[PDB]
PDB file of C-alpha atoms in Angstrom:
ATOM      1  CA  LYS A   1     133.199 118.149  95.332  1.00 30.15           C
ATOM      2  CA  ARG A   2     133.229 118.443  99.154  1.00 31.05           C
ATOM      3  CA  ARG A   3     130.928 121.338  99.996  1.00 31.21           C
ATOM      4  CA  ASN A   4     127.418 120.320 101.199  1.00 29.53           C
ATOM      5  CA  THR A   5     125.368 122.957 103.172  1.00 27.74           C
ATOM      6  CA  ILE A   6     121.741 122.876 101.814  1.00 28.90           C
ATOM      7  CA  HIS A   7     120.961 121.160 105.127  1.00 27.55           C
ATOM      8  CA  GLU A   8     121.407 124.559 107.026  1.00 28.19           C
ATOM      9  CA  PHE A   9     118.355 125.990 105.201  1.00 30.84           C
ATOM     10  CA  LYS A  10     114.445 125.946 105.874  1.00 29.85           C
ATOM     11  CA  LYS A  11     112.713 125.358 102.573  1.00 29.30           C
ATOM     12  CA  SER A  12     109.436 127.227 101.742  1.00 28.94           C
ATOM     13  CA  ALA A  13     107.952 125.425  98.629  1.00 29.27           C
ATOM     14  CA  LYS A  14     106.443 127.496  95.728  1.00 31.86           C
ATOM     15  CA  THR A  15     107.572 130.812  97.428  1.00 30.85           C
ATOM     16  CA  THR A  16     109.852 133.579  96.311  1.00 28.94           C
ATOM     17  CA  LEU A  17     110.823 136.908  98.017  1.00 28.26           C
ATOM     18  CA  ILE A  18     110.151 140.457  96.902  1.00 30.78           C
ATOM     19  CA  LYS A  19     111.484 143.469  99.017  1.00 29.09           C
ATOM     20  CA  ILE A  20     109.272 146.420  98.529  1.00 28.90           C
ATOM     21  CA  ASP A  21     112.165 148.805  99.791  1.00 26.49           C
ATOM     22  CA  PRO A  22     114.426 148.589  96.729  1.00 26.31           C
ATOM     23  CA  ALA A  23     117.655 149.011  98.901  1.00 26.31           C
ATOM     24  CA  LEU A  24     119.658 146.133  99.695  1.00 25.89           C
ATOM     25  CA  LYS A  25     120.861 144.673  96.119  1.00 27.56           C
ATOM     26  CA  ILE A  26     120.624 141.225  94.947  1.00 27.40           C
ATOM     27  CA  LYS A  27     122.746 138.756  93.029  1.00 29.57           C
ATOM     28  CA  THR A  28     121.364 136.288  90.558  1.00 26.41           C
ATOM     29  CA  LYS A  29     123.084 133.570  88.409  1.00 24.73           C
ATOM     30  CA  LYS A  30     122.467 130.766  86.002  1.00 24.43           C
ATOM     31  CA  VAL A  31     123.010 127.528  88.114  1.00 26.26           C
ATOM     32  CA  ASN A  32     121.877 123.996  87.502  1.00 25.35           C
ATOM     33  CA  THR A  33     120.913 122.767  91.149  1.00 22.18           C
ATOM     34  CA  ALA A  34     119.627 124.236  94.331  1.00 22.93           C
ATOM     35  CA  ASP A  35     122.827 122.759  96.201  1.00 16.82           C
ATOM     36  CA  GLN A  36     125.150 125.014  94.266  1.00 15.94           C
ATOM     37  CA  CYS A  37     123.092 128.151  95.453  1.00 15.47           C
ATOM     38  CA  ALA A  38     123.303 127.010  98.845  1.00 16.24           C
ATOM     39  CA  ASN A  39     127.128 126.531  98.744  1.00 16.57           C
ATOM     40  CA  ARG A  40     127.614 130.046  97.320  1.00 12.91           C
ATOM     41  CA  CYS A  41     125.277 131.426 100.020  1.00 14.87           C
ATOM     42  CA  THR A  42     127.162 129.789 102.777  1.00 15.50           C
ATOM     43  CA  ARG A  43     130.702 130.323 101.321  1.00 18.67           C
ATOM     44  CA  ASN A  44     133.320 132.860 102.806  1.00 20.24           C
ATOM     45  CA  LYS A  45     133.637 135.930 100.370  1.00 23.45           C
ATOM     46  CA  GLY A  46     131.164 134.269  98.102  1.00 26.43           C
ATOM     47  CA  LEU A  47     128.859 137.091  97.820  1.00 28.98           C
ATOM     48  CA  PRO A  48     129.216 140.920  98.286  1.00 29.84           C
ATOM     49  CA  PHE A  49     126.989 140.739 101.283  1.00 30.62           C
ATOM     50  CA  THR A  50     126.063 138.254 104.105  1.00 27.93           C
ATOM     51  CA  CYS A  51     123.684 135.854 102.445  1.00 31.60           C
ATOM     52  CA  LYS A  52     120.659 135.089 104.700  1.00 31.19           C
ATOM     53  CA  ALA A  53     118.382 133.558 102.218  1.00 31.37           C
ATOM     54  CA  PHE A  54     118.124 132.330  98.585  1.00 32.98           C
ATOM     55  CA  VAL A  55     115.591 131.333  96.073  1.00 30.70           C
ATOM     56  CA  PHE A  56     116.101 128.646  93.407  1.00 29.04           C
ATOM     57  CA  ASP A  57     113.918 129.258  90.205  1.00 29.37           C
ATOM     58  CA  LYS A  58     113.487 125.563  88.802  1.00 28.45           C
ATOM     59  CA  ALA A  59     112.162 126.532  85.562  1.00 26.53           C
ATOM     60  CA  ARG A  60     114.815 128.988  84.637  1.00 27.25           C
ATOM     61  CA  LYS A  61     117.446 127.388  86.684  1.00 25.29           C
ATOM     62  CA  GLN A  62     118.596 130.469  88.695  1.00 24.07           C
ATOM     63  CA  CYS A  63     119.686 131.420  92.213  1.00 25.34           C
ATOM     64  CA  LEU A  64     118.485 134.544  93.842  1.00 24.20           C
ATOM     65  CA  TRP A  65     120.780 135.568  96.717  1.00 20.91           C
ATOM     66  CA  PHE A  66     119.262 137.916  99.390  1.00 18.50           C
ATOM     67  CA  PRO A  67     121.032 139.615 102.271  1.00 23.72           C
ATOM     68  CA  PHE A  68     117.550 139.349 103.885  1.00 26.52           C
ATOM     69  CA  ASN A  69     114.986 136.671 104.788  1.00 28.51           C
ATOM     70  CA  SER A  70     111.117 136.533 104.922  1.00 27.13           C
ATOM     71  CA  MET A  71     111.184 137.947 108.472  1.00 26.32           C
ATOM     72  CA  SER A  72     113.101 141.179 107.447  1.00 23.02           C
ATOM     73  CA  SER A  73     111.267 144.504 106.954  1.00 23.75           C
ATOM     74  CA  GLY A  74     109.536 145.378 103.705  1.00 22.21           C
ATOM     75  CA  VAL A  75     109.690 142.017 102.097  1.00 21.65           C
ATOM     76  CA  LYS A  76     106.827 139.838 100.824  1.00 19.73           C
ATOM     77  CA  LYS A  77     106.332 136.346 100.051  1.00 20.64           C
ATOM     78  CA  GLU A  78     105.055 135.642  96.498  1.00 18.50           C
ATOM     79  CA  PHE A  79     103.646 132.489  94.910  1.00 20.89           C
ATOM     80  CA  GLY A  80     105.057 130.511  92.021  1.00 21.26           C
ATOM     81  CA  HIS A  81     105.419 126.690  91.391  1.00 22.51           C
ATOM     82  CA  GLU A  82     108.879 127.318  89.882  1.00 22.43           C
ATOM     83  CA  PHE A  83     110.346 129.049  93.103  1.00 25.41           C
ATOM     84  CA  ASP A  84     111.840 127.374  96.189  1.00 25.11           C
ATOM     85  CA  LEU A  85     112.782 129.603  99.124  1.00 25.31           C
ATOM     86  CA  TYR A  86     115.645 128.443 101.381  1.00 26.38           C
ATOM     87  CA  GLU A  87     116.340 130.461 104.597  1.00 23.04           C
ATOM     88  CA  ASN A  88     119.538 129.751 106.684  1.00 20.13           C
ATOM     89  CA  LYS A  89     118.439 128.298 109.880  1.00 19.53           C
ATOM     90  CA  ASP A  90     120.988 130.570 111.894  1.00 18.82           C
ATOM     91  CA  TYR A  91     118.610 133.656 111.482  1.00 17.65           C
ATOM     92  CA  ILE A  92     115.502 131.843 112.385  1.00 20.47           C
ATOM     93  CA  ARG A  93     116.879 130.074 115.554  1.00 21.74           C
ATOM     94  CA  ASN A  94     114.839 131.456 118.324  1.00 21.55           C
ATOM     95  CA  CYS A  95     116.858 128.796 120.440  1.00 19.89           C
ATOM     96  CA  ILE A  96     120.366 127.813 121.139  1.00 21.04           C
ATOM     97  CA  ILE A  97     122.487 125.030 120.291  1.00 21.04           C
ATOM     98  CA  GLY A  98     125.273 124.484 123.062  1.00 23.18           C
ATOM     99  CA  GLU A  99     127.478 127.695 123.313  1.00 27.29           C
ATOM    100  CA  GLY A 100     125.456 129.361 120.566  1.00 28.27           C
ATOM    101  CA  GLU A 101     128.143 130.032 118.338  1.00 31.40           C
ATOM    102  CA  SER A 102     126.093 129.535 115.410  1.00 32.97           C
ATOM    103  CA  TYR A 103     123.150 131.661 116.837  1.00 30.77           C
ATOM    104  CA  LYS A 104     122.281 134.716 114.553  1.00 27.74           C
ATOM    105  CA  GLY A 105     118.646 135.412 115.687  1.00 30.35           C
ATOM    106  CA  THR A 106     117.104 138.908 116.571  1.00 30.76           C
ATOM    107  CA  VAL A 107     117.439 138.886 120.346  1.00 32.76           C
ATOM    108  CA  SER A 108     118.659 142.295 121.368  1.00 34.71           C
ATOM    109  CA  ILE A 109     117.854 142.316 125.181  1.00 36.67           C
ATOM    110  CA  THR A 110     120.157 141.078 127.973  1.00 37.18           C
ATOM    111  CA  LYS A 111     119.101 138.480 130.873  1.00 36.94           C
ATOM    112  CA  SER A 112     118.369 141.338 133.157  1.00 34.94           C
ATOM    113  CA  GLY A 113     116.213 143.040 130.513  1.00 37.66           C
ATOM    114  CA  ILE A 114     118.520 145.908 129.364  1.00 36.41           C
ATOM    115  CA  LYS A 115     118.758 146.831 125.592  1.00 34.71           C
ATOM    116  CA  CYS A 116     122.017 145.694 123.896  1.00 31.67           C
ATOM    117  CA  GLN A 117     124.641 148.080 122.649  1.00 28.86           C
ATOM    118  CA  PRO A 118     125.120 148.295 118.872  1.00 28.87           C
ATOM    119  CA  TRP A 119     128.322 146.371 118.097  1.00 29.28           C
ATOM    120  CA  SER A 120     129.553 148.864 115.730  1.00 30.39           C
ATOM    121  CA  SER A 121     129.183 151.482 118.290  1.00 31.05           C
ATOM    122  CA  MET A 122     131.759 152.502 121.008  1.00 31.98           C
ATOM    123  CA  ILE A 123     128.919 154.065 123.165  1.00 31.20           C
ATOM    124  CA  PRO A 124     128.652 153.534 125.949  1.00 30.81           C
ATOM    125  CA  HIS A 125     131.293 151.082 126.085  1.00 34.74           C
ATOM    126  CA  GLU A 126     134.289 151.088 123.543  1.00 36.39           C
ATOM    127  CA  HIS A 127     135.464 147.746 122.566  1.00 35.21           C
ATOM    128  CA  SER A 128     137.339 145.897 119.647  1.00 36.78           C
ATOM    129  CA  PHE A 129     134.501 143.435 118.848  1.00 38.94           C
ATOM    130  CA  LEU A 130     133.923 144.994 115.542  1.00 36.25           C
ATOM    131  CA  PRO A 131     132.412 143.134 112.340  1.00 38.37           C
ATOM    132  CA  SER A 132     135.692 143.756 110.494  1.00 39.31           C
ATOM    133  CA  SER A 133     137.594 141.890 113.207  1.00 36.96           C
ATOM    134  CA  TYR A 134     135.141 139.001 113.427  1.00 33.56           C
ATOM    135  CA  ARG A 135     133.731 138.121 109.885  1.00 35.87           C
ATOM    136  CA  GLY A 136     131.115 135.340 109.670  1.00 34.39           C
ATOM    137  CA  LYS A 137     130.028 136.014 113.260  1.00 35.36           C
ATOM    138  CA  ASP A 138     127.214 138.276 112.273  1.00 34.95           C
ATOM    139  CA  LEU A 139     128.100 141.103 114.684  1.00 34.72           C
ATOM    140  CA  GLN A 140     125.236 143.261 113.207  1.00 36.70           C
ATOM    141  CA  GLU A 141     123.010 145.928 114.990  1.00 38.77           C
ATOM    142  CA  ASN A 142     122.658 145.010 118.613  1.00 38.83           C
ATOM    143  CA  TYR A 143     121.821 141.335 118.579  1.00 37.77           C
ATOM    144  CA  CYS A 144     123.097 138.831 120.984  1.00 35.85           C
ATOM    145  CA  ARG A 145     126.259 136.984 119.726  1.00 34.86           C
ATOM    146  CA  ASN A 146     128.905 134.508 120.934  1.00 32.79           C
ATOM    147  CA  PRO A 147     131.888 135.463 118.614  1.00 37.69           C
ATOM    148  CA  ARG A 148     134.644 133.751 120.500  1.00 36.92           C
ATOM    149  CA  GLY A 149     132.372 130.694 121.193  1.00 38.55           C
ATOM    150  CA  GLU A 150     132.657 131.242 124.972  1.00 37.28           C
ATOM    151  CA  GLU A 151     130.805 129.058 127.762  1.00 36.03           C
ATOM    152  CA  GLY A 152     128.385 131.846 128.845  1.00 34.79           C
ATOM    153  CA  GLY A 153     126.483 131.738 125.627  1.00 34.05           C
ATOM    154  CA  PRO A 154     125.258 134.633 123.427  1.00 37.33           C
ATOM    155  CA  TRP A 155     126.031 138.006 125.023  1.00 32.99           C
ATOM    156  CA  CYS A 156     126.285 141.741 124.188  1.00 32.60           C
ATOM    157  CA  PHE A 157     127.487 145.124 125.314  1.00 32.96           C
ATOM    158  CA  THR A 158     124.782 146.829 127.403  1.00 30.99           C
ATOM    159  CA  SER A 159     122.963 150.163 126.935  1.00 30.67           C
ATOM    160  CA  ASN A 160     123.474 150.949 130.634  1.00 27.67           C
ATOM    161  CA  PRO A 161     126.731 152.616 131.341  1.00 26.27           C
ATOM    162  CA  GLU A 162     127.236 150.903 134.638  1.00 25.59           C
ATOM    163  CA  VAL A 163     127.188 147.412 133.066  1.00 23.76           C
ATOM    164  CA  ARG A 164     129.681 146.704 130.318  1.00 23.54           C
ATOM    165  CA  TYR A 165     128.397 143.366 129.177  1.00 21.14           C
ATOM    166  CA  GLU A 166     125.930 140.646 130.193  1.00 20.23           C
ATOM    167  CA  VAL A 167     124.674 137.321 128.814  1.00 22.01           C
ATOM    168  CA  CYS A 168     121.210 136.986 126.941  1.00 23.91           C
ATOM    169  CA  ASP A 169     118.631 134.419 127.982  1.00 21.79           C
ATOM    170  CA  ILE A 170     117.997 132.368 125.044  1.00 22.25           C
ATOM    171  CA  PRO A 171     116.785 128.667 125.812  1.00 22.89           C
ATOM    172  CA  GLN A 172     118.633 125.635 124.503  1.00 23.04           C
ATOM    173  CA  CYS A 173     116.845 124.043 121.437  1.00 22.42           C
ATOM    174  CA  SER A 174     115.979 121.068 123.465  1.00 23.45           C
ATOM    175  CA  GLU A 175     113.793 123.173 125.785  1.00 21.54           C
ATOM    176  CA  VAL A 176     110.202 123.154 124.136  1.00 20.24           C
ATOM    177  CA  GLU A 177     111.209 120.517 121.658  1.00 19.68           C
ATOM    178  CA  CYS A 178     109.334 117.494 123.094  1.00 17.87           C
ATOM    179  CA  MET A 179     107.318 114.597 121.745  1.00 18.15           C
ATOM    180  CA  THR A 180     104.176 112.359 122.797  1.00 16.97           C
ATOM    181  CA  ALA A 181     104.815 108.747 123.032  1.00 17.24           C
ATOM    182  CA  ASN A 182     107.461 107.332 120.498  1.00 14.83           C
ATOM    183  CA  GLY A 183     107.159 110.566 118.515  1.00 17.85           C
ATOM    184  CA  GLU A 184     105.107 109.289 115.809  1.00 19.71           C
ATOM    185  CA  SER A 185     103.244 112.721 115.787  1.00 17.64           C
ATOM    186  CA  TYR A 186     106.505 114.706 116.377  1.00 19.65           C
ATOM    187  CA  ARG A 187     106.830 117.605 113.944  1.00 17.00           C
ATOM    188  CA  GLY A 188     109.332 119.729 115.723  1.00 18.21           C
ATOM    189  CA  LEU A 189     112.569 121.271 114.478  1.00 15.82           C
ATOM    190  CA  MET A 190     115.229 118.900 115.854  1.00 15.04           C
ATOM    191  CA  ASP A 191     117.947 118.433 113.013  1.00 15.71           C
ATOM    192  CA  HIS A 192     120.766 116.552 114.758  1.00 12.87           C
ATOM    193  CA  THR A 193     121.178 112.852 116.036  1.00 11.58           C
ATOM    194  CA  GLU A 194     121.609 111.869 119.720  1.00 16.86           C
ATOM    195  CA  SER A 195     125.522 111.783 118.950  1.00 17.33           C
ATOM    196  CA  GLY A 196     125.467 115.306 117.434  1.00 18.06           C
ATOM    197  CA  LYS A 197     125.694 114.251 113.768  1.00 14.31           C
ATOM    198  CA  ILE A 198     123.729 116.493 111.301  1.00 14.76           C
ATOM    199  CA  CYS A 199     120.628 115.124 109.678  1.00 11.99           C
ATOM    200  CA  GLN A 200     120.371 114.504 105.787  1.00 10.91           C
ATOM    201  CA  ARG A 201     117.665 116.264 103.994  1.00 13.59           C
ATOM    202  CA  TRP A 202     114.736 114.002 103.291  1.00 17.45           C
ATOM    203  CA  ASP A 203     114.388 115.566  99.643  1.00 19.09           C
ATOM    204  CA  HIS A 204     117.863 114.441  99.110  1.00 20.09           C
ATOM    205  CA  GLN A 205     119.391 110.807  98.061  1.00 21.06           C
ATOM    206  CA  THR A 206     122.868 111.995  99.193  1.00 18.81           C
ATOM    207  CA  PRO A 207     124.874 110.560 100.831  1.00 19.05           C
ATOM    208  CA  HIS A 208     122.318 107.996 101.681  1.00 21.25           C
ATOM    209  CA  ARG A 209     119.467 106.569  99.370  1.00 19.04           C
ATOM    210  CA  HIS A 210     116.043 106.018 100.717  1.00 21.93           C
ATOM    211  CA  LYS A 211     112.369 105.437  99.952  1.00 24.53           C
ATOM    212  CA  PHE A 212     110.926 108.341 102.169  1.00 24.13           C
ATOM    213  CA  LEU A 213     110.092 110.808  99.335  1.00 25.98           C
ATOM    214  CA  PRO A 214     108.368 113.922 100.576  1.00 29.78           C
ATOM    215  CA  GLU A 215     106.176 113.891  97.437  1.00 29.11           C
ATOM    216  CA  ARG A 216     105.123 110.403  98.488  1.00 30.78           C
ATOM    217  CA  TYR A 217     104.508 111.043 102.065  1.00 32.57           C
ATOM    218  CA  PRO A 218     102.574 114.327 102.672  1.00 31.07           C
ATOM    219  CA  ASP A 219     101.224 114.438 106.347  1.00 30.24           C
ATOM    220  CA  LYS A 220     104.567 112.673 107.300  1.00 31.68           C
ATOM    221  CA  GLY A 221     106.342 115.850 107.764  1.00 24.59           C
ATOM    222  CA  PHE A 222     109.376 115.194 105.643  1.00 25.10           C
ATOM    223  CA  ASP A 223     110.637 118.812 105.633  1.00 26.10           C
ATOM    224  CA  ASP A 224     114.172 119.924 105.523  1.00 25.03           C
ATOM    225  CA  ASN A 225     116.324 117.567 107.595  1.00 24.71           C
ATOM    226  CA  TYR A 226     114.055 117.214 110.821  1.00 25.87           C
ATOM    227  CA  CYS A 227     113.912 114.127 113.050  1.00 24.29           C
ATOM    228  CA  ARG A 228     111.008 112.175 112.224  1.00 24.58           C
ATOM    229  CA  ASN A 229     109.252 108.723 113.302  1.00 25.73           C
ATOM    230  CA  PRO A 230     107.427 107.794 110.127  1.00 24.93           C
ATOM    231  CA  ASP A 231     107.719 103.957 110.645  1.00 22.96           C
ATOM    232  CA  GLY A 232     106.972 102.821 114.171  1.00 22.36           C
ATOM    233  CA  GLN A 233     110.346 103.125 115.392  1.00 25.30           C
ATOM    234  CA  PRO A 234     111.002 103.423 119.327  1.00 24.15           C
ATOM    235  CA  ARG A 235     112.256 106.988 118.799  1.00 22.18           C
ATOM    236  CA  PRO A 236     112.494 109.648 115.971  1.00 23.53           C
ATOM    237  CA  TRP A 237     115.421 109.371 113.688  1.00 20.87           C
ATOM    238  CA  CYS A 238     117.000 110.659 110.485  1.00 24.43           C
ATOM    239  CA  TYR A 239     119.582 109.802 107.975  1.00 25.96           C
ATOM    240  CA  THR A 240     123.092 111.207 108.661  1.00 23.38           C
ATOM    241  CA  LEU A 241     125.405 113.332 106.441  1.00 23.94           C
ATOM    242  CA  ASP A 242     128.232 111.106 107.491  1.00 23.66           C
ATOM    243  CA  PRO A 243     128.806 108.549 104.708  1.00 25.26           C
ATOM    244  CA  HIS A 244     129.824 105.741 107.346  1.00 26.55           C
ATOM    245  CA  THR A 245     126.383 106.292 109.566  1.00 25.49           C
ATOM    246  CA  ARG A 246     123.343 105.590 107.445  1.00 23.77           C
ATOM    247  CA  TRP A 247     120.764 106.595 110.025  1.00 24.19           C
ATOM    248  CA  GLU A 248     120.785 107.458 113.885  1.00 24.98           C
ATOM    249  CA  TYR A 249     118.041 108.019 116.683  1.00 27.02           C
ATOM    250  CA  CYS A 250     117.496 111.498 117.831  1.00 29.68           C
ATOM    251  CA  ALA A 251     117.385 112.535 121.523  1.00 31.74           C
ATOM    252  CA  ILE A 252     113.870 114.290 122.003  1.00 32.61           C
ATOM    253  CA  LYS A 253     112.572 114.275 125.454  1.00 33.21           C
ATOM    254  CA  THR A 254     108.899 113.405 126.084  1.00 30.58           C
ATOM    255  CA  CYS A 255     106.536 116.242 126.969  1.00 26.98           C
ATOM    256  CA  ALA A 256     105.561 113.958 129.953  1.00 27.13           C
TER     257      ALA A 256
END
């Protein structure tokens, strides 16, 4: 099979999600691995809603797909060794990657400080940027989006009737992401190599085999697919999802 999208998720071990508010339905299915839950969560037309997070029950072997994450309203985290929560990074972001096409955070205020207009609303500014016309772009509520992958970055229509649209001020992910020395103590959230290749998850042996087992190295920060320096390398690094590139250095600026 070809689909491999589990890297796109932030894992919270021993955690499941419950929503107090019974609204927003959930789909559950008997599935063998967490990888299959992830591919279904990120697939186009895979679920009767936009999947933001999922939980893999390891004991019962089930996926639990949610249209919400742990940062939504009326949703609690709950304990259980058999559970593993996975939240799509796009909705946690807080920062931007390049044009910010993948950005799906909760910023709803323009660069000037004006509240964004709802995307599904024609007031004050009528338009054609509707969720129906741009599936997969998460044109929900009044959050800053970059649907057409334009140079300016994430933008929105403005609540002020005098300004139609404006860009939003969201910093590039390489903004606060800095390291001390050779990055031995770096525990940040960088997940792509210096050439822009996507990092392989540490808790995975595909497509590259390695000895850096998260269970074997607590305190080493082998979470998700973040760039790490666990072996005295000149710079932090990660294994790559490209079969023809085992590993590659990451580009994290020094805090000094």
